[PDB]
Design an enzyme around this catalytic site. Structure first.
Site, PDB file in Angstrom:
ATOM      1  N   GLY A 137      -7.367  -0.707   0.651  1.00 13.67           N
ATOM      2  CA  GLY A 137      -6.419   0.252   1.222  1.00 13.67           C
ATOM      3  C   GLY A 137      -6.849   1.679   0.923  1.00 13.67           C
ATOM      4  O   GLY A 137      -6.705   2.576   1.755  1.00 13.67           O
TER       5      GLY A 137
ATOM      6  N   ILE B  16     -10.121   1.166   4.382  1.00 14.90           N
ATOM      7  CA  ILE B  16      -9.384   1.061   5.648  1.00 14.90           C
ATOM      8  C   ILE B  16      -8.499   2.278   5.831  1.00 14.90           C
ATOM      9  O   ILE B  16      -7.578   2.492   5.064  1.00 14.90           O
ATOM     10  CB  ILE B  16      -8.495  -0.216   5.744  1.00 14.90           C
ATOM     11  CG1 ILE B  16      -9.335  -1.464   5.518  1.00 14.90           C
ATOM     12  CG2 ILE B  16      -7.762  -0.256   7.115  1.00 14.90           C
ATOM     13  CD1 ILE B  16     -10.527  -1.623   6.426  1.00 14.90           C
TER      14      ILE B  16
ATOM     15  N   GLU C 212      -8.850 -10.393   4.036  1.00 15.02           N
ATOM     16  CA  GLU C 212      -8.550 -11.501   3.109  1.00 15.02           C
ATOM     17  C   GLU C 212      -9.784 -12.160   2.499  1.00 15.02           C
ATOM     18  O   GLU C 212      -9.809 -12.427   1.311  1.00 15.02           O
ATOM     19  CB  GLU C 212      -7.679 -12.541   3.795  1.00 15.02           C
ATOM     20  CG  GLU C 212      -6.299 -12.040   4.198  1.00 15.02           C
ATOM     21  CD  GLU C 212      -5.453 -11.492   3.043  1.00 15.02           C
ATOM     22  OE1 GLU C 212      -5.619 -11.772   1.819  1.00 15.02           O
ATOM     23  OE2 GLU C 212      -4.549 -10.716   3.389  1.00 15.02           O
TER      24      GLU C 212
ATOM     25  N   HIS D 177      -7.078  -5.679  -2.522  1.00 12.17           N
ATOM     26  CA  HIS D 177      -6.285  -5.060  -1.467  1.00 12.17           C
ATOM     27  C   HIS D 177      -5.990  -3.633  -1.746  1.00 12.17           C
ATOM     28  O   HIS D 177      -6.002  -2.808  -0.816  1.00 12.17           O
ATOM     29  CB  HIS D 177      -5.020  -5.842  -1.184  1.00 12.17           C
ATOM     30  CG  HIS D 177      -5.261  -7.211  -0.612  1.00 12.17           C
ATOM     31  ND1 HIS D 177      -6.108  -7.435   0.420  1.00 12.17           N
ATOM     32  CD2 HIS D 177      -4.664  -8.421  -0.888  1.00 12.17           C
ATOM     33  CE1 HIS D 177      -6.065  -8.734   0.747  1.00 12.17           C
ATOM     34  NE2 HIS D 177      -5.168  -9.322  -0.028  1.00 12.17           N
TER      35      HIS D 177
ATOM     36  N   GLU E 167       0.791  -1.209   0.000  1.00  9.48           N
ATOM     37  CA  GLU E 167       0.000   0.000   0.000  1.00  9.48           C
ATOM     38  C   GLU E 167       0.839   1.281   0.000  1.00  9.48           C
ATOM     39  O   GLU E 167       0.492   2.239  -0.684  1.00  9.48           O
ATOM     40  CB  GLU E 167      -0.970  -0.008   1.206  1.00  9.48           C
ATOM     41  CG  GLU E 167      -2.007   1.136   1.135  1.00  9.48           C
ATOM     42  CD  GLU E 167      -2.952   1.161   2.338  1.00  9.48           C
ATOM     43  OE1 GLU E 167      -2.861   0.222   3.147  1.00  9.48           O
ATOM     44  OE2 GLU E 167      -3.778   2.110   2.470  1.00  9.48           O
TER      45      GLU E 167
ATOM     46  N   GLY F 297      -5.543   4.814   7.080  1.00  5.37           N
ATOM     47  CA  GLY F 297      -4.123   4.645   7.443  1.00  5.37           C
ATOM     48  C   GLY F 297      -3.511   3.616   6.514  1.00  5.37           C
ATOM     49  O   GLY F 297      -4.133   3.200   5.571  1.00  5.37           O
TER      50      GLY F 297
ATOM     51  N   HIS G 217      -8.001 -10.801  -7.174  1.00 10.49           N
ATOM     52  CA  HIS G 217      -7.878 -10.870  -5.678  1.00 10.49           C
ATOM     53  C   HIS G 217      -7.058  -9.727  -5.192  1.00 10.49           C
ATOM     54  O   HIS G 217      -7.496  -8.947  -4.347  1.00 10.49           O
ATOM     55  CB  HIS G 217      -7.214 -12.200  -5.197  1.00 10.49           C
ATOM     56  CG  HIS G 217      -6.782 -12.227  -3.708  1.00 10.49           C
ATOM     57  ND1 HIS G 217      -7.300 -13.048  -2.836  1.00 10.49           N
ATOM     58  CD2 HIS G 217      -5.835 -11.464  -2.971  1.00 10.49           C
ATOM     59  CE1 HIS G 217      -6.766 -12.875  -1.613  1.00 10.49           C
ATOM     60  NE2 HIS G 217      -5.858 -11.921  -1.674  1.00 10.49           N
ATOM     61  N   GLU G 218      -5.830  -9.594  -5.688  1.00 10.78           N
ATOM     62  CA  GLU G 218      -4.902  -8.654  -5.068  1.00 10.78           C
ATOM     63  C   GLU G 218      -5.267  -7.218  -5.330  1.00 10.78           C
ATOM     64  O   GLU G 218      -5.028  -6.345  -4.497  1.00 10.78           O
ATOM     65  CB  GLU G 218      -3.483  -8.935  -5.523  1.00 10.78           C
ATOM     66  CG  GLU G 218      -2.966 -10.268  -5.005  1.00 10.78           C
ATOM     67  CD  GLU G 218      -2.640 -10.238  -3.525  1.00 10.78           C
ATOM     68  OE1 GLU G 218      -2.378  -9.145  -2.991  1.00 10.78           O
ATOM     69  OE2 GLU G 218      -2.628 -11.311  -2.910  1.00 10.78           O
TER      70      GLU G 218
HETATM   71 CA   LIG Z   1      -5.591   2.632   3.825  1.00 11.32          CA
HETATM   72 ZN   LIG Z   2      -4.884 -11.334   0.015  1.00 14.73          ZN
END
Ligand SMILES: [Ca+2]
Ligand SMILES: [Zn+2]
EC number: 3.4.24.3
Length: 392
Positions: A135, A139, A161, A131, A102, A141, A127-128
Site C-alpha cells: 500500500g 500501489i 495476494e 499489504h 490502508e 492510491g 503476510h499481512e
Molecule cells: Ca497505496
Molecule cells: Zn492477504
C-alpha cells in the site's frame, strides 16, 4: 450516553497494553495476555520483510505524502474470541485471521494457538505486513480506490495476494518458501493453475489462487526476475495499461507456463525444507553497547560506501540505528545483472559484519533501492542498514 467514550473504554479493556517503536512510527496495541517477547519478534520480523521487499520492488519512498500509513498501528487481541469484538470496537470485518486497512494504516489480528490456526501470529503478521508495504511503496492510491482498482477491480488481485504470501518468507538475506503454502499446491500437476488462469484470478473465484499466486511469485524471484521487475515498475508508475499489456503477454507465453509448472514441481519436491523462516533468537539477546561511530565505520568498510549518515531511533525496549549511503556501480551490466550484483554484495556485507565479534551485527537488515543514472551515466543506488544499537 457518550458512545465514543464507551468504545474507547472497551478498547482500553481488551487492548490494555501499548508498545511503541521507531520514534512512534510503529504502535502496537495488545491484549494483556499477548507476550512482550512475541511483540518484539514481530518488530524484527517486520524489518526482515521490509528489507527484502525494498530490494525486490526497488523503491523505499512512499508513493504519496501524508497518508495514514506514515504510522503503522498493529492491534492484537488476546485470542480469536476477543478478536470478534473488533467489528464493534473499530468497525472492520472479523471474518478472517486478521485484516489490514490502508486508510488508517492499521493491521488487526489476534494471538492464537497451533490448534486455532495453521499460521502462527508471526507468520500471519509477516503476510499481512506486506499489504502495508504494498500500500505504501508499490500501489498508488488507497486499496479498492486507486486507479489499479477502477474498471477491473480484480486486475492486480493475484499479485497483491500472491506476493504478500511470498514476502512472508523473508529472512535477513533472502525470501524462502513456506511449508503452509507449498503443502496446499496439488500433488497432481494437472490440477495446478497455469499462468493464464492465475493472472486473471479474482476473489470471487475462491481461494486456490492464493497458493498459486504465492508459487508464481517464488517462480519470478528465482527464475524470472525480469517479469517481477517489470510488473512492479508498472505498479509504481500507476501504469494500468502497461500492467494489463504485460499480463496478456505473460498469459500466452508457453515458456513462462512451462517454467512456472517446473517451479511448482520443484517446490512440492522440496516441501520438507520449507519450515517458516521465523526470526532468530539473536534479536532478543543483550549485547555490549557499541558506538554509532564504530558501527558506521564497520558498515562503511563491509559495504564499500563512504560519507554515510547514521541516525539513532528509540523504541521502548531498545534503541536502533539506520545507516544511509549511496553506492555507485563501477559497471552497468543491465537490470537483472545489477540487481544480482547488489543483492549478493549486500548479503556479503551482512556476512562480514556477522563474522565480527559484536553480536549486535546479527540483528542487521539491509537493502538497496531507487537506482538512477548519474551525470556520467553510472548507476547509483540508495543503501540502508538497520540494526539494534542497545537494549534498555
Ligand atoms: Ca497505496
Ligand atoms: Zn492477504
Amino acid at each position: 450516553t457518550d458512545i465514543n467514550k464507551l468504545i474507547e473504554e472497551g478498547k482500553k479493556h481488551y487492548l490494555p497494553k501499548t508498545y511503541t517503536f521507531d520514534n512512534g512510527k510503529i504502535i502496537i496495541k495488545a491484549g494483556d495476555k499477548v507476550e512482550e517477547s512475541k511483540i518484539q519478534k514481530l518488530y524484527w520480523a517486520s524489518k526482515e520483510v521490509k528489507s527484502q521487499f525494498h530490494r525486490i520492488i526497488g523503491n523505499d519512498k512512499p508513493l504519496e505524502v501524508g497518508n495514514a500509513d506514515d504510522i503503522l498501528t498493529i492491534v492484537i487481541y488476546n485470542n480469536p474470541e476477543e478478536y470478534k469484538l473488533n467489528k464493534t470496537l473499530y468497525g472492520y470485518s472479523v471474518d478472517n485471521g486478521g485484516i489490514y486497512i490502508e486508510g488508517i494504516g492499521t493491521f488487526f489480528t489476534y494471538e492464537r494457538t497451533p490448534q486455532e490456526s495453521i499460521y502462527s501470529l508471526e507468520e500471519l503478521f509477516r503476510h499481512e505486513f506486506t499489504h502495508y508495504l504494498q500500500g505504501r511503496y508499490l500501489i498508488p492510491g488507497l486499496f479498492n480506490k486507486g486507479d489499479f482498482y477502477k474498471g477491473n477491480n480484480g486486475r492486480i488481485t493475484w499479485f497483491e495476494e500472491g506476493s504478500a504470501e511470498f514476502f512472508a518468507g523473508s529472512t535477513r538475506t533472502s525470501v524462502l518458501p513456506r511449508k503452509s503454502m507449498v503443502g496446499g499446491l496439488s500433488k497432481n500437476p494437472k490440477e495446478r493453475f497455469n499462468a493464464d488462469k492465475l493472472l486473471h484470478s479474482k476473489y470471487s473465484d475462491g481461494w486456490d489462487f492464493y497458493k498459486y499466486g504465492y508459487a508464481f511469485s517464488d517462480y519470478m524471484y528465482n527464475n524470472n526476475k525480469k517479469l517481477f521487475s517489470d510488473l512492479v515498475s508498472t505498479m509504481k508508475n500507476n501504469d494500468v495499461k502497461g500492467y494489463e499489456a504485460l499480463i496478456e503477454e505473460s498469459s500466452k507465453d508457453s515458456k513462462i507456463n512451462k517454467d512456472y509448472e517446473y517451479h511448482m514441481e520443484n517446490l512440492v519436491n522440496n516441501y520438507d525444507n520449507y519450515t517458516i523462516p521465523l526470526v532468530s533468537d539473536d534479536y532478543m539477546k543483550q549485547y555490549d553497547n557499541k558506538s554509532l561511530h564504530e558501527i558506521k565505520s564497520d558498515i562503511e568498510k563491509a559495504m564499500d560506501v563512504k560519507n554515510s549518515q547514521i541516525t539513532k531511533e528509540s523504541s521502548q525496549y531498545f534503541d536502533t540505528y539506520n545507516l544511509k549511503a549511496t553506492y555507485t556501480l563501477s559497471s552497468n551490466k543491465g537490470e537483472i545483472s545489477n540487481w544480482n550484483y547488489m543483492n549478493n554484495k549486500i548479503n556479503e556485507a551482512l556476512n562480514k559484519l556477522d563474522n565480527l565479534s559484536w553480536g549486535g551485527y546479527k540483528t542487521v537488515t539491509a537493502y538497496f533501492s531507487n537506482p538512477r543514472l548519474n551525470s556520467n551515466n553510472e548507476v547509483v543506488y540508495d543503501i540502508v542498514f538497520h540494526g539494534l544499537l542497545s537494549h534498555n
